[PDB]
Symmetry: D2
Subunit: 211 residues, 4 copies
């Protein structure tokens, strides 16, 4: 499962351990489907969340740095990210669509906002490359690059921590850009753990986007 | 893979996510085997441990309470255990073999130590059952049961946290009983992640039992 | 602040870092009291919990093993506990009061339950000491001791993790014995962080005992 | 204690809980100085690290985003940071000194590298302000700002996690800029916990800068 996000981003599921029944078993310490689903709903409605820690996902995510900065605040998870110390960074930036400013009256046209953002990221990358090609170490040269630069990372997260992520990021209070990533994560979670996901939405989910 | 431990215990692998290449990919943020193995050795010799967090195991363990008490100190992991509040606990106790006291001069024969331990656990269980059958709540009745009572749990742990567990518990300083569990865990880890395990032993393992 | 719990237990505050204003500052990234209290209520009502991580407590707790087993499931915290490998364990056991069985019809008198529990713990300790004095290693001898043995530990926990503890343990679903410890912890928390505590009760606390 | 770092940064100690004796007590589960220091050295030389979790610091740090990105990878800690969604961000950027490129042959003079970096950050901030003043939401406008923008955060971290931070960041392999922050953190740690710090350097510290 891979899902395009923003202009150049994505979320892809790399691997998964377990399923709805992993939670039921772990909860039972196990050596019918009606009862297994009822147990899942029971755990979720009563706040017994530890059984869902036995379901684990790994994702590969391509996202702008400002999104990754928010995402990496989720400590109960594992990350490995592309390094600007160790590699030349690619010319790939998130440029908002003109629809991104719908709702806001602006004293310059939304298409001109879009062009101003493109212009400055182009000048910044041009400076970065000039510095690199003059022998400035990569780890110093990259400091001129803007926060809308794309980066990539692997994320390994269990279903309990993923539910926390969805409560906080699949929600109107989160920045729109990370909401879009959260909606993709939710779609994948629903596909792999349908009983857990539906019970989550019904009983435990705290946000206001997923339905 | 299931391995008998002590007189009545076991360790069984329930599920696993990933393999040696999960660490190599996560480390590379990947979209030959000589080079993949060399990278693993490189990460291990230099202390780059986060890539190993993307390999995850779930075990089902049957162990005495005093062993479980030590094991559950490992916080960077997930546990679900049989409850003495919620179920009648089974008459199953760890009785040391007479060889357990080899090295120690004792003023009573090692076989008589073994019998004294059996005798007291029998009296304790008899009291527990008397209390249960008189209508004492299970959660109170069980408090008379000794620390050598067997319990069971599911344990979900990533390879980095598992390496920490092995450093501390597959080692002469750990209590012999948990060492035996750690040796089983190591065998399973070696089988599922041979490059990681061998690199761990060569470069990072801090204990004094595994070879 | 020290508070007696059960027959022989206690909870004592050893140290604390910070206060209500630590959360306000951390939240503001700070270089009036009406507004500082309003901010605390705001964070709590909206689920902004990370600012409360900057308030930290250390407690010294004396509790029976079966209570400690439940308590030590709280992973987002730090523990150091008395060792039965490293010391001779003291003859101190939790003996329920006869009022502990109020609500339950029992086919033996509650005072006789109390005596049966005393009798078995006395026999168990007598066996433990016999084994110790015959040269059995402490770490083996102790396995005959029951779960109502008292132990002692230091617990270092931040206010966010403490609120989670109180949601789960200051609640009717938790075992009565640990509820009594949780009520003491809550009293200390209220004393040291009154604005945070009152805002917690009003907006975020999930249990059904604290008022 | 406050220490200037880089051109415009700082590290300041806001609060601390405990001292060397907190570790000794927690380790002993306590109800002379020669022996207390010997215990600290003992714990450190043998890898008994949990007692140091009972010493906790809070710092206020002003650092460029690229430094903060590395720092916030340390998950076993607590953070609260200034938000570009919620505030107008200040015109403050890290401009490397010309000495930062000592060792590297560059095909443009180090002073001209310094000017090129200043020039691009000035153009970027000018764009950011133009967008803000045209009614673009702050959370979108800020995406044009470079990684050398200064940010500020509160960091609450225990001494065990701080030792891990120092092993990794007070070391030649870490980026020079974060090394400078780590050296300041080490100075503060040494001042507040001299026995722990000296024992750390002697027995456990894995880096190659602190002496
Ligand atoms: C709309 C929005 C606005 C935000 N604005 C800001 C801001 O202005 N500044 C800012 O710095 N941050 C901000 N954040 C980030 C926020 O403070 C958290 O870092 C982020 O939401 C991750 O949440 P978490 O701690 O629950 O997740 P994780 O770190 O994954 O933790 C998961 C759970 O584990 C527990 N936990 C983990 N570590 C600890 C610990 N050390 N102590 C106690 N419990 C722990 C908690 O129960 C937590 O819910 C914002 C987040 C959102 C959604
Ligand atoms: C031989 C032996 C004797 C022992 N004797 C005693 C004893 O007498 N009393 C006693 O109480 N305990 C004792 N322990 C338990 C020991 O104190 C640890 O709780 C246990 O070894 C788990 O280790 P850990 O913290 O590394 O593992 P985990 O808790 O899984 O943590 C893994 C890693 O995460 C980090 N970590 C996790 N949480 C935190 C945190 N809050 N702060 C900082 N870093 C964190 C550390 O880097 C740690 O190594 C003993 C252990 C051994 C092996
Ligand atoms: C009434 C009651 C009955 C119980 N019955 C049982 C039982 O029968 N069997 C049993 O095994 N346990 C039982 N428990 C224990 C329970 O499963 C938890 O271990 C305990 O409540 C601690 O909760 P916690 O994980 O929220 O706390 P902590 O471990 O302190 O974690 C705090 C927060 O950090 C987050 N967190 C920490 N680590 C992880 C992680 N690895 N992944 C995801 N999120 C994490 C979560 O947001 C969590 O709320 C019972 C608890 C209660 C209160
Ligand atoms: C020179 C250098 C280069 C780096 N290059 C890269 C890079 O190119 N890409 C990149 O993504 N990162 C990079 N890092 C970051 C690195 O991968 C770590 O995220 C960072 O060093 C924090 O280390 P930590 O996990 O030990 O600390 P913390 O996250 O604070 O954890 C402390 C300890 O707790 C334990 N721990 C905490 N959480 C878990 C968990 N979920 N599972 C198992 N154990 C856990 C471990 O014992 C750990 O040592 C680099 C770091 C350094 C110093
Ligand atoms: O919605 C938000 C706002 C802030 N932050 C965290 C991420 C950064 O560490 C810091 C500042 O982020 P921005 O507000 O600048 O995105 O707070 C989030 O995680 N989510
Ligand atoms: O080798 C040991 C010794 C102690 N402990 C922890 C477990 C308990 O929380 C406490 C006391 O354990 P015993 O020494 O009684 O086993 O310290 C361990 O984890 N391993
Ligand atoms: O109310 C409970 C019930 C269980 N447990 C955890 C503690 C043990 O690890 C295991 C079994 O505990 P008992 O139900 O036997 O107390 O589950 C709790 O933390 N709280
Ligand atoms: O020395 C380093 C290199 C990388 N990273 C982490 C931080 C980011 O999440 C990611 C990329 O950082 P840079 O290499 O671009 O600084 O890896 C570090 O923590 N320290
Ligand atoms: Cl490119
Ligand atoms: Cl049986
Ligand atoms: Cl005594
Ligand atoms: Cl300004």
């Amino acid at each position: 499962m891979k899902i395009d996000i923003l202009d150049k981003g994505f979320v892809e599921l790399v691997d998964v351990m377990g399923n709805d029944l992993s939670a039921v078993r772990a909860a039972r310490v196990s050596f019918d489907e009606e009862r297994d689903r009822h147990l899942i709903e029971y755990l979720m409605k009563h706040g017994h969340e530890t059984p869902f820690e036995h379901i684990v996902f790994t994702f590969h995510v391509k996202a702008p740095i400002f999104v990754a900065r928010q995402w990496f605040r989720h400590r109960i998870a594992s990350y490995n990210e592309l390094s600007g110390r160790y590699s030349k960074l690619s010319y790939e930036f998130y440029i908002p669509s003109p629809e991104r400013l719908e709702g806001y009256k602006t004293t310059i046209p939304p298409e001109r906002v879009t062009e101003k953002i493109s212009e400055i990221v182009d000048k910044a990358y041009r400076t970065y490359l000039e510095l690199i090609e003059s022998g400035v170490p990569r780890e110093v040269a990259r400091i001129v690059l803007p926060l809308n630069l794309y980066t990539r990372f692997f994320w390994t997260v269990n279903a309990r921590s993923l539910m926390n992520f969805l409560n906080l990021r699949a929600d109107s209070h989160a920045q729109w850009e990370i909401q879009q990533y959260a909606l993709a994560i939710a779609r994948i979670f629903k596909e792999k753990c349908p009983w857990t996901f539906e019970a989550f939405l019904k009983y435990a989910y705290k946000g206001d986007i997923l339905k």
